[PDB]
């Protein structure tokens, strides 16, 4: 959820 | 936990 921009964002939540 | 998987 830190890099809640992409990886910790899943594009929105958290994933990639 | 940034882009750490």
> Which among B3, A16, B4 is positioned nearest to A3, based on CA atoms?
B3
B2 in the Ramachandran plot: left (φ > 0), alpha (ψ -120 to 50) or beta? beta
User: Phi, psi at residue B3, to the nearest 5°?
Assistant: 25, 45
Kindly list the residues from chain B whose CB atom is less than 8 angstroms away from the CB atom of residue A8: 1-3
Residue pair B1/A1 in contact by the 8 Å Cβ criterion: yes
Kindly list the residues from chain A whose CB atom is less than 8 angstroms away from the CB atom of residue B4: 7
Contacts A–B by Cβ distance under 8 A: 15
- On whether any CB of chain B is under 8 Å from the CB of A8, the answer is yes
Kindly list the residues from chain A whose CB atom is less than 8 angstroms away from the CB atom of residue B3: 2-3, 6-8
């Amino acid at each position: 959820r830190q890099i809640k921009i992409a990886f910790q964002n899943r594009r929105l939540k958290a994933k990639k | 936990p940034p882009i750490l998987l």
